Amino acid sequence: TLRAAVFDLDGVLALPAVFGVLGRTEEALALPRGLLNDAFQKGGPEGATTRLMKGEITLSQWIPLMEENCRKCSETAKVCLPKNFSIKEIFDKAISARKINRPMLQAALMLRKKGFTTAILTNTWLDDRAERDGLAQLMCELKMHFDFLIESCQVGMVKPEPQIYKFLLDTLKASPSEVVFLDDIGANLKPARDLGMVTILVQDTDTALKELEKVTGIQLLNTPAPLPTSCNPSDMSHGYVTVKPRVRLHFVELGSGPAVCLCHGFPESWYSWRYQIPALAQAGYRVLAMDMKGYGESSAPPEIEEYCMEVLCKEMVTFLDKLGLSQAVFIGHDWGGMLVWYMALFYPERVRAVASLNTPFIPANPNMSPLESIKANPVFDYQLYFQEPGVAEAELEQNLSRTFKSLFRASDESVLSMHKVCEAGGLFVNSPEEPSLSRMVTEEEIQFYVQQFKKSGFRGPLNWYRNMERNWKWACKSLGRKILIPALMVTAEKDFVLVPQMSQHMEDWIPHLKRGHIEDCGHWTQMDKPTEVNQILIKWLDSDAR
Amino acid sequence: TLRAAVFDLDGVLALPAVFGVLGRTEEALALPRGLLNDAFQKGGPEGATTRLMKGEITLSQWIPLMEENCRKCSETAKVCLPKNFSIKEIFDKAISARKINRPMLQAALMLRKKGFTTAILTNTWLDDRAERDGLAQLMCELKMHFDFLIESCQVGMVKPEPQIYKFLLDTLKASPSEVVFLDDIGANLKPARDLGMVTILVQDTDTALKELEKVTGIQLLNTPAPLPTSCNPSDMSHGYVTVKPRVRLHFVELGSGPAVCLCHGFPESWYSWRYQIPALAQAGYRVLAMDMKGYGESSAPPEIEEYCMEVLCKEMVTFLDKLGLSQAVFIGHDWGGMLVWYMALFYPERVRAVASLNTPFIPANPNMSPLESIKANPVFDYQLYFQEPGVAEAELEQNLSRTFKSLFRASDESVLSMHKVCEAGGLFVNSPEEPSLSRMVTEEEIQFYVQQFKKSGFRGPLNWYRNMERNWKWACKSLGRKILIPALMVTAEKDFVLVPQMSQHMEDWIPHLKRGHIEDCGHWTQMDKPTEVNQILIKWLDSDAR
Ligand SMILES: O=C([O-])c1cc(C2CCCCC2)ccc1O
Numbered sequence A, B: 001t002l003r004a005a006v007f008d009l010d011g012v013l014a015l016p017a018v019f020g021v022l023g024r025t026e027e028a029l030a031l032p033r034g035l036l037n038d039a040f041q042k043g044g045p046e047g048a049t050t051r052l053m054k055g056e057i058t059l060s061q062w063i064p065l066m067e068e069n070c071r072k073c074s075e076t077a078k079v080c081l082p083k084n085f086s087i088k089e090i091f092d093k094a095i096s097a098r099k100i101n102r103p104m105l106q107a108a109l110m111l112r113k114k115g116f117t118t119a120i121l122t123n124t125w126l127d128d129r130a131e132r133d134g135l136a137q138l139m140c141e142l143k144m145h146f147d148f149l150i151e152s153c154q155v156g157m158v159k160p161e162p163q164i165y166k167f168l169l170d171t172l173k174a175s176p177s178e179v180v181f182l183d184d185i186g187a188n189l190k191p192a193r194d195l196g197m198v199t200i201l202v203q204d205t206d207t208a209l210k211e212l213e214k215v216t217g218i219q220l221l222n223t224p225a226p227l228p229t230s231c232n233p234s235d236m237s238h239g240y241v242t243v244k245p246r247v248r249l250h251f252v253e254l255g256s257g258p259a260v261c262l263c264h265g266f267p268e269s270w271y272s273w274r275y276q277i278p279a280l281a282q283a284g285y286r287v288l289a290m291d292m293k294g295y296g297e298s299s300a301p302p303e304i305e306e307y308c309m310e311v312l313c314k315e316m317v318t319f320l321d322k323l324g325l326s327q328a329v330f331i332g333h334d335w336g337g338m339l340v341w342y343m344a345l346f347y348p349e350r351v352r353a354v355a356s357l358n359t360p361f362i363p364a365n366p367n368m369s370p371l372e373s374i375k376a377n378p379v380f381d382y383q384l385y386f387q388e389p390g391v392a393e394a395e396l397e398q399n400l401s402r403t404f405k406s407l408f409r410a411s412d413e414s415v416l417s418m419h420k421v422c423e424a425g426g427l428f429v430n431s432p433e434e435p436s437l438s439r440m441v442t443e444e445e446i447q448f449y450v451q452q453f454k455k456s457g458f459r460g461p462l463n464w465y466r467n468m469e470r471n472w473k474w475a476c477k478s479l480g481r482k483i484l485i486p487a488l489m490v491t492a493e494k495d496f497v498l499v500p501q502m503s504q505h506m507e508d509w510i511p512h513l514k515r516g517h518i519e520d521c522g523h524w525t526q527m528d529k530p531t532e533v534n535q536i537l538i539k540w541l542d543s544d545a546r
């Protein structure tokens, strides 16, 4: 049986192939056929290209040696090289033009999902070009999805030498017949074939993958639309900032650039944004997925007053102040969405841009007590149940697995009531003791929220709802203000509490507000429809927050 | 300076390339990419293909070794070879499908015309397949146009080994930089390049030839329409048959198949058919270009009566009888055209098919003496001048060069009168002593007719015209007959004696007669418009004489 797949970079994982750019430059400049490809391989294992692929010299060092061999080949062919000929400009263009072959990356990912061991085996160089960042950005994005990455310039060997094949085989800890090897170079497959490994000459992606599925007996073509890339909590950078002596806040960091502070709801985690952290970092953002106060690894003080909007927003400001951030894009959901709107109302200097998932901005009524406002709407009866201290904690802290399995469900799958939650005596009263697993989450994803909620419980989480009177008095100070900073409101079609219509009037308060909308999407926006969340957020970030 | 051009066969001189048929068979049978091309090259210099190209085994011996390596590669790739898989059938098809790349052959010919030394350098096999004749027919047709042909299987070496390059260089008697080398195999050019020879990677013919002209500084693309391939009298098979004790006939032989006896006119040679002998042999015919009685190497008896149609046709029959031919296609021109029509009237059993250039069939008038018939038409005054024995001989045998230069001219270039030739006192009376060279002939071609006419003179040639009374009495015996065998009449637009209109009535005598017609064509049909003569004759031969 097969248990390992090997991918070549150029021509297989990334397109177009750099070999083809030599053949393209000969046609553009009308130089004789194969002149550039022959000057590239001059010497064979003794040439400048092999010293480059083996890693003896840098690509900056290599440039003038190729140039010399280009001059040499043109002299022999009895032809002339043009005036503005620059090897650097040709390679700069070819590298920058080269992008990931997405169907190939998805085939790798599908193979690795079925337990296969995956690796990139490439003849590469040590790029010290002033424009090296581009090739580096590319490599990181591919590498992350494979078990190994074998770069010829770091090991000191090259394809087609037999040694690298015995090195990779040793790294894979597998035998030849257990390995599928994909290369666009016919001669680079011959050693792998002579060893007994299954070989695929990659001309077109579709035929290559058709051979790759017939041989694996695993479907790789015509597959359903894949989920965005998620997080393994063990592989993240974990951050901790002390905002006040008794309170510390925890976050997860990924990417470089404009700071994007992610704020989860109830009863959630930094992990709720798991399908958004890799995508948003890939889009050129510094993602900071918070564990809001009362959750995971952030401090959970017992007092109710520690969770009023004024205290929590001062702490988000202190967090910035201590991290050295003058600004942050603030993207919230559910309770974080509320925090995020009040971050914009009270601290616009510190907020670059503001986005909210499901949660709308709705001003305070200086003529109505907030308690009356909750009773007035039947869907908000669960908030009245969360009022008495200890009541919902006892129910939610009873069987954590059951709690998250009963809550984290898609619109149709809903096992919850939410019409006289107070009367019925709880949220899970008519929910099973052993609920089925939702299609939105895995067993492992459920098991992560369980571990997290074992530290502090639901007192802190529920205390965010226990400050309605405090929140109202503070908000009334902002009644004559308008949100005049970039803003994105995202409504979810099947969210039965945070209904799309509840946002209808927001323009009176945020005139330049951008909108988003996800169909057949319930309350758990981020995991229900991650792809759509990603497409909407990246679009608004590039247009409204550079 | 460059003085040698080297052509690879497969992909350069012949298309399509046999390498491509492996890649085509993998797509048709949906076998993995490169499976057949890798099984073909398995072993490298140690494999079955190298032993075949070096010539250690035959291609029949090779077939089951490739089959074994095909089975082996499919096992490693974890795939299955089909039910009706036959390497023999694949190669049989590929060889038979492969034909000459005509623009490449014309580039070779144009280079060799400008004094270049040309040669075919090919990695080939010793073909013992029952269908070997096809590859053999192909090779002969290319080889003939090149100075050398280097077949790897006969020398015992292969491309890319450095030795064959030093062998070819030695055969060419030239140095590296003096040699242009054309190959479709990138690695087969690398040794030739490393040696200092100019290299051309042949992808498409047009770009390959564009490099080949930029480097030679000789025009090869967009050239005018080339002349058909001619004869070098030194390179022909020369034949001699004794018809009667005093008379022997000479001929030139080329090709295999149905016998095609070519009959020249006055004052011509077997050489008049020079542009027809190679073309007609290529078309699958056994060409027999006669030196009719009185010319070149055939016997020239002095008597007039030896040249009457009855004596000459009995001798063409005796020739057949002695050569072992029951039949022959009989193609004549001018006086041979007359002989040819009477060959069909008197000996249809021995004549397969009959074709005439310019000369029409015209029955005898049993009520008018042939002398009166010649006087009756002003264009035939030259025939009256040819009557008195010795008269025209003295004029034509005076300065042979002048005679052939004055006669062998195209329609416009005509320096001859032909209106009262008798009165004026000769054919060349108002023609220069030193006529210019015609565009139809070279100096060397003129010089060949001179050498030939030095042996016997014009007595025998002119004696063909001195039997008008004898010819008439014999022809009157055939007055109630019709020519009911295949027949082709070819008229020439600008022939001022043998006018197209003179043939108008021929259908009364040959009902099923096929016709041909060449525009802006004078009396010297064969050299005036050889290409058109070839196209017409081959067409009629394939349709009417198998
Ligand atoms: O099932 C759902 O889609 C769904 C779930 C909720 C829960 C989130 C806050 C705590 C308890 C209710 C709210 C609205 C919904 O529409």
Ligand SMILES: O=C([O-])c1cc(C2CCCCC2)ccc1O
Pocket (backbone or CB within 6 Å): B266, B267, B382, B407, B409, B410, B411, B414, B416, B494, B495, B496, B497, B498, B522, B523, B524
């Ligand atoms: O110049 C011509 O094309 C031309 C030449 C001839 C010669 C051939 C037979 C012997 C003498 C005349 C006849 C007709 C022509 O039209």
